[PDB]
Every structure is written in structure tokens, then in C-alpha cells.
Amino acid sequence: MAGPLSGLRVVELAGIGPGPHAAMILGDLGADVVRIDRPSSVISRDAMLRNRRIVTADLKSDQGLELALKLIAKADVLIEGYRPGVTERLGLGPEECAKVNDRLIYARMTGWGQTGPRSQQAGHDINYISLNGILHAIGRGDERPVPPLNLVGDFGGGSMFLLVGILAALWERQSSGKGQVVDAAMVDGSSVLIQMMWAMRATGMWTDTRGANMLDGGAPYYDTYECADGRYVAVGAIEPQFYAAMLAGLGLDAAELPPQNDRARWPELRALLTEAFASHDRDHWGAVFANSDACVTPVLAFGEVHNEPHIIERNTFYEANGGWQPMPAPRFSRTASSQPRPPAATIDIEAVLTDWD
């Protein structure tokens, strides 16, 4: 099996969102990933279940439990993302796992954490980011907050911190010879994800007013603009030298505009930039500014990404069943990753305990 995480053995108790996204990446990088789903369901639809062996097993039954408990015994990592108490009351808790394998990295993916008042509440991405200030900061100032899909709570502030915890604990287990419990809460990870704003907030460089900051769309030089065809460009020309390059491509003379960072005159500035970008279509701007430091790029829809040169040449995507999918990231010089394998039709848990000798 190809990739830097070759050898690594992972047990994933089937859940939704972060838990599986973490498991995918471990797989992606060559870990051996075994997912136990409920029998009361089931070759899979979700391309998120790539780089995976799937096994049936009713964990409520006494048999199901011990089979599971065997897999965990011969494995490096356990991933679960159920509310607190669920694995305990199944007989798969940390304390129970530590008795068949004190090397186990016990990885617990939740929104709210393992304790505290909200620890039993149901929730999704949007709820976790609502409590820690993030959601309030996203969207235009004249309107209600808009959810950044489930990118910030589930994945960026959830799965990815689960991965860092798993892999940091594996580094630890090289010294001490023992595993441990990784407690990944989306509300905490997403908070560290936005540490920049907490830092800027302290030094007067970020306010709580939505749509009135450097990076939220309030700056006319860091925002999207509608073009003549109703498609969009993005502008991220923060540094003055890049902003100057953008102005020249737009045909605007700096002498006729207000200063880039005079906020009181951002309305005028925005109006000027808006009229300029509105006068040609996205693909015009795309050409004018390619190879340029103007920080102006076309805003592509998913369906167009496969035609973008830089995306094609670096193989950011591969084809798989009437749909493109992202190739693993990041990339490794010596132990490169493979193309992911599609979800691996169900298997029997004995066959896996056997294969794992």
C-alpha cells in the first residue's frame, strides 16, 4: 500500500462528517482503514468512503462486540464520532480498549466535547461555529450570517484536528510505548482555526461588525466582483504593489481613486472598482491578469474546474464514476500516495482478522 502512512492500521466506527473525512485522509495516505458499519443499512455511493474496507457488525450483540474488540486489539487507531457515552455503553470505551491494546490511539470526534452542558445536544457544523463567534463573522453586513458550507466546523476545525491529534499521538507513542485518548471537539478546533482573528481582535485590527474588515469582504481589494456576463472574479490584492498592478490592468489611474486603505472612502473606491470589473466578462479579466501579481482570478463553478489549466497539469483531480474527485493532499517527494480505490464492497470481519494475522 502506497503513501507515508503505510503500515498504519485504523479502525473507524461508522458515523457522519468529520469522523469519515479523517478516516479518508488516513486511507488516502496509505493507512489500512477498516470501517465497521451497522448491518441495518447496506457497493457504496459515497466517494468519501474511498481507501476503505467496510465490515458489517451489530455492536449491540455480544458476538459483534468481541469481533470488534479483536480488530481494535490488532490496530493502531480507533476513530469514533458518536455522542459521549455511546462507545462506553457499547463496551468499546477508552478504558475497555486500553485493556486489549494499551498502544491504541483512541480518537473521539465530537462537536461540543466530551463534557459540559451541550455535550449531549445534537448539532451540526453550523451550530458548533455559531457558539464561538465564527458564523457571526461570515457574510455581508446588511444581511444575516451565511454558513460557509460545512467546511469550517466539520473539516477544517474537526476532522483535520482529529488527524493532527492522531498523528501527534503516534509520534508520542514512539517515545513512551503507550497510546492515549484524543479529544477533538469541532468547537475547539474551529476556534484555533480562526486564531488569526482572535489575534487581530486584540490589537484593534478586527471588529465584530460583519462585512467591515480586511478579509470578510469589507475591503474593496479583497472581495468578489460581478463581471459583464454575470460571472465573477475574486480580488485579493492586499499588498500595495499587487493592488497597483490590478489598477493598471483595470485601466484605472491611481490619481483618480481614493487611497487603497482610506476606509472612509471605501464606498467610492468600491463603486469605481465595481464599474470597471462590470465592463468586461470574467474571461476577459482572466486573460488580462494571467501570469500577473494582480491577485485577480476567475471564480469557477465546480463544473468548470476540470477545464482550468493549472488544475489539469498538477492533477489536483481524478475521474471516478461520472464525477471528478480530489487527489490526496498534501504531496510527498519519496513516499507518494496512489490514486484512491473506490469503496471496497463489504467484507467479513473474520477475513480481516485473518489477513491481519
Place this chain on the structure above:
Amino acid sequence: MAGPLSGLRVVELAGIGPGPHAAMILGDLGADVVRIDRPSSRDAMLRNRRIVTADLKSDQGLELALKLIAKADVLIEGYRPGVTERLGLGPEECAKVNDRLIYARMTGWGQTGPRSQQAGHDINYISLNGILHAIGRGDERPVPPLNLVGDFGGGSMFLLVGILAALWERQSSGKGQVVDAAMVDGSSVLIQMMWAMRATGMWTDTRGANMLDGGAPYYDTYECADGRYVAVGAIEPQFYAAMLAGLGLDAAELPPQNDRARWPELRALLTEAFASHDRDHWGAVFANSDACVTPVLAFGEVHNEPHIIERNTFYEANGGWQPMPAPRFSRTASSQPRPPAATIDIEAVLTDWD
């Protein structure tokens, strides 16, 4: 030093956004982190570091740097491609003085290809791979999700997964290697769920018309009587039904939860209901509930929130609050971040390491 990464040694060449964030998290978890800046701190992102100066273009500045890297486990650089090569700090020069080094390259566009030398920021990397187009209301231009998705989630976090996966690989092979983390790639994997969903006909390229983009009335924010907001995330029918009951809404009178043609009508009924009381009222009503209804707090209110206070998600420092390390560890727990450690001379650090 407290944390699961005690005695990991990390050299960081100073830049902006992702590279510093990754270095921060490494520090947060107990790693020894030395950051080389240029002779020309306030940012709390520079927490859990030692800062040193060094003209990397001088003969001596370079010599010193290579003496650090020789002793360290990980090097982090976030410059445009070619930049570290020309300084004399490229992968191959580093592999001469330390074949074990994990060499971590943090860019937006990647190491090669047509845009590889183009300046950019977060908003640009996510414009090219479909992400930015997908965010915001439908009647309107896309809105940047701050720089959470390219710099951090699709950026620093993938650098970290790569640094630590390469540390694992090393333990079996004795050898370092190069980690190429590009924000346009990481952010693409970060949104793999949408790519899966699109392949099976359960996501469209229309903005504001999906389960998770704000187009679903059960997955969106709502304005309340006081002008503040709640978030609703009641995807599962049982959670949704719990929410209707607490709103005072008889299910029989409403359109089906998932009849999309009638979402606008559904949304107008839920809008009226949420508008009729203040945000704090809904926070009370739905506490301990599975209704998936939560107050949308502004940054300055977060320190007053029970679940935040009691789990110590933040700590106080300097101006105000900062996030404590994540994730958390049972045995080898992280400590409260140290503020940034004012300029020390780089020779000191070298005697301190062997």
C-alpha cells in the same frame, strides 16, 4: 515542554498565514519552534516560539540557518517556489546537512505549473477550485469565508497532516522527505464531501440551493426579534420535528421538510416564528434539546457562554481571549501557550541544542 510533541524540533522561516499557523499548532502541542525572521511581537500567532533574526542573504546568516536545520526535525517555509533554492536553503542543500529533515513547503498554487509564480491569497486559491463560487446567497456575489478555508483548513492543517505523517514514515525508513502542501489541493480535499454529493446528483452548482449552503430552511440562520441571530441545523427529521414543536408550529400546516420547490414558503413560516422572540429566549427554549438551534454569538460574547467557559476553550492574554490548544490529549496534555519570546541570538539556541 508539555504536549505529545515534546522534543520535536521545528525551524520556521517567517512568512504569513498558513506557515505561521502550522508552526503555532506545532508549538501548541509542545514542539520546540524556532522562527527565523529578517532584521526588519504583537501577533499572538507567534505564540510558543523562539524568534531569531538573520539576513539569509548574508554568508553568515545562511551558515547559522543551516546549523539550526542540521539539528532540527522539521523545516517550514511558505515562500514562492525557487525562493529557498536561491537562498541556499532548498531541499537538496538541507538533505546534505540532515537526510532526516522533514522539509515542509506551504504554498497556494503548488511547486510547479502555470500559476506557480503568481502572487495570491486565500480568496484566489478558493476561487479556482469551485469553493468560493459555492458560498453565499444565490441572489448575490460570492462571499469569502474569511481566510479559514484556504489558509488554514485547506492550508496549514494539510501542512501539519504532512509533517506528522512524514514523521511516522521516517520511523520505519530512517529518512526525511519533502511535503508539498498547496492550498488549492488541501482545500479541494477539505470539500471532498461536495464533490461526492455532486457525483450522486445531491449537490448543484447553483449557489444558495443546497442542503448545507444556506438554501435549506432547516440549515441556515434566522433573525430574531432583537436583531440578533440563531442558527438552525436540524437536518435529521426527528431534530427538525423537535424544533417545530418548540417554535409552536404544527407540522401538518407546513410544507414537507425536504420539498425543495416549497422551501421559500417554508422559510417564510420559520422566519415569522423566529422573528417573534429574542435570541436569548430561543437559547433558553432549546437548551438540552436536540432541535439543533443555537445562538449566533459575536466574538465579544463568547467568553460569557457556559459551555465555552467550563471547557476552557479560551484563555485570557494581553488584549483579550485566545483559543487554547486543540485537540486535547488524556496523558500528555498541552499547556497554556507562552507569549512570543523576544529576540534571542541564534548562537544561544545552537548551544542549547547540543
